[model samples]
Target: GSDKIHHHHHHVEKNLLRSALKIFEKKDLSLLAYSGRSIFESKDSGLKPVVELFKRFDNLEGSLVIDKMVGKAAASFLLKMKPDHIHAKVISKPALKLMNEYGQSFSYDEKIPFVLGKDGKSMCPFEKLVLEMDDPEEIIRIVLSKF
Candidate 1:
């Protein structure tokens, strides 16, 4: 029973990764990077698909970004992939709290929620900055500044 469940989960993950890669193939690399900024910053269901795609891409190419909203499955996949460029950010509590407060001041389609690691600390600076800001272009600029 355990083996069957494990196999089934693995199959599903594989399918998800495949679908992500297929979608990724239609977009330019820069576009993927741009779109991925927000998706990877998410901790919700959105995170899984992007992470899956990223992991697949990283495995094939060797590069990735966004912060650490990536879950254990994606993180582990990326690690195994050994990408040349993987940007993982660690945010402070003050930053997370500030971002959460700032986000409420504006009207947005989706609200990014605060996420804590097993150590009970904020997980991503990139997410905080993206969530706090209003403009997508500005968000891209901010992310570029980190480089």
Candidate 2:
């Protein structure tokens, strides 16, 4: 049986990905940047307002990456906004791998990290995805700053 909270999380991720994709793709944005952290974390605490800001700006094509370690809601929001490419720096290997596998395939544009967890074993598929990118940082900086 699915817990209520889990159900809610799944729902949020779906809608947010859809909404994000619609708005961003329509704007002809080249990339989608996402990070997630909860209210306690200052990284994405300001995202709600930032997203509102995007609504106000018509030409903005990119999506804001929420840092989820701070909170799951932010992660859900990013899931809602289906990004063309994903670049996660702080998430667990499983989380990153799951996102890449279930969502869009990691294209050459999506340049996520490959530093194995502190234990020193790299996430096999995630590392392979990183290898696929030509110049990962090239699009990353632009994606990060847009939102």
Candidate 3:
């Protein structure tokens, strides 16, 4: 019975992520861009606002090169929004260890570290999604397929 329940929970989470993808696909690009800007600018920006905004459209919760970068950001946001099961790709050993210590899954990738901005300036990672895909639906599909 416990195994069945666990399986059922996974199914539910996947479905919720799927539904969120559809809504994200349908969302206006301008709005997504605006939201992405908002998220990137605020240091203390919580996932609650983003989650709540998405929920306004539908009831669901929930990455490549240019496509990969956007997908990664979307995936990261999903992780931040729902940390229960979502995982991320970590480049460094230390980051991997840290995420593991927190009981989060992370796959190692060499290219991941280079994505960060040079020098002390850090880029707004989440903005990649908004910047890369003009068509909201296309990005949503791309990102969903990636995960």
Candidate 4:
């Protein structure tokens, strides 16, 4: 049971990071330095559905039926989206807090609560990571759902 739990945790973390990277690597997100392919990014953005569910239910006074990790990943993914997109999407203080915490940890920076671009040109590492990944949506959703 312990091993199963640990393995699950590892898998979830891996998937979460993987998904986050995939989301950012999309051309829509403007991170096409690695593969130079826009088709995949366009195709993968469909994961927005999962993100929509998480953002819509991440309020402060209530809990979503989904797992906490999934909720966190959703929040995290939403934050990586453009501000206007997120503003029109969901609004959750707790979910936002979780996303903020997760973003900061990715950068391993205490002062900067947000993750930086792997290229050192931007301030959104989560977005960059997600977009860079190849097929980040499914893995990201799985990690977020099960984490």
Candidate 5:
């Protein structure tokens, strides 16, 4: 009778992450997502890839995301998409806190205080924009407005 509710917990390591990581490095991609049958990937960095993923799939309830890095800004929108798992090569402390608070499943290779801007001396502008905010929509709305 419980045939359709088996995805409650993730006990085994998914093999998909292996290949995804390979493709990520080979193509120098910024973000990639696998939705079972579909694969979404991007080469340019930042939140545009994440934003476009949301625009295409209203809710990524069971999708898997692999990103080069994540900060509070990108994490905000990514979590809202409701993905099943997220893997990042690097993640910011604030973004880690946000994901932990939401009980989101994720893995990372490195964790930093925060994402740096293009100049490398300051925090990323996107992170600053939503640092004080918890509403994902706020960030998305601003992104949509800007781009």
Candidate 6:
């Protein structure tokens, strides 16, 4: 195969998604959040961690947020963050739709109908919370009030 010349391309710069992905794999963290300059990791599950992270800054614009599992509820909050990009290892249909409508850059490994509960027999609690919600801010408000 005749390939093109090397070193002709532009310099390879920072890759936030891949960087966070490596940490997600090696460290086995459920979440890896990048807010412009700061990086945060968490092994804990559920929406609480996200809520706490959101509270750290009212706005997460220009951030790179990666989560292990993303359902509608989590995506709702992430949308509020308004980050530059979002990534997920496993994402649900509703969540994907929400993010798609938000029109942001995002990547995911797999898509499922919906996130399930720990027992694997019910819907994710967080998703249930936002089932009747749509507006990102309202979702955040309801979620924040509950927590």
- TM-score against native, each model: 0.27, 0.27, 0.28, 0.21, 0.85, 0.83
Which consecutive 10 residues in model 4 have the weakest lDDT in total? 60-69
Q: Pick the candidate with the highest TM-score.
A: 5
lDDT of 2 at 111: 32
Candidate 2 lDDT over 1-147, as tens digits, reads 446542212223444454544544554443344323111112233235434433443321233433323112222234444543333324444345546545532222233344343355654333344333333333233333445
Off by over 4 Å in 3: 1-12, 28-82, 87-97, 105-111, 118-147
Candidate achieving higher TM-score, 1 or 3 = 3
Cα-based lDDT for every prediction: 0.36, 0.36, 0.32, 0.33, 0.79, 0.77
> What is candidate 5's lDDT per residue for 21-56, written digit by digit as tens?
777788888888865544787878677787787788
Candidate 1, residue 20: Cα displacement in angstroms equals: 20
Task: Give the lowest summed-lDDT range of ten residues in model 1.
Answer: 6-15
Off by over 4 Å in 2: 1-73, 105-147
lDDT score at residue 131, model 1, on the 0-100 scale: 53
TM-score of decoy 3: 0.28
Clashes (N, CA, C under 3 Å) per candidate = 0, 16, 4, 15, 0, 0
Q: Is candidate 2 or candidate 5 better by lDDT?
A: 5
- TM-score (C-alpha, index-matched) for candidate 1: 0.27
Best candidate according to lDDT: 5
Cα displacement (angstroms), candidate 4, residue 122, comes to 38
Choose 3 or 4, whichever is better by TM-score.
3
